[PDB]
Amino acid sequence: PIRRSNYTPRNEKGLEGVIELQLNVVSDYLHVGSGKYDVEVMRSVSDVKRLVE
């Protein structure tokens, strides 16, 4: 079932801090998409000066 407990105000002072995690992939195959289906142009060759298009 659901425990309908009263909410805690955000202004009330509890504990504040930053914890740094470390995410590791164990199965060497991880993909999270972004909806894109095109190239990423990694090298980004800018050799259009001598021949422009």
Partner RNA sequence: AUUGAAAGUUUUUUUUUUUUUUUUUUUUUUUUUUUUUUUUUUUUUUUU
Q: Which residues bind RNA (CB under 7 A)?
A: 31-35
Count of helices and strands (H, E) across the chain? 0, 0
CB of 24 to RNA, least distance (A): 16
CB of 50 to RNA, least distance (A): 38
Q: Which is nearer to RNA, 22 or 34 (CB)?
A: 34
Q: Which is nearer to RNA, 17 or 33 (CB)?
A: 33
**4, 17, 23 from 20: Cα distances, Å:** 31, 10, 10
Determine phi and psi for 34, rounding to 5 degrees: -135, 10
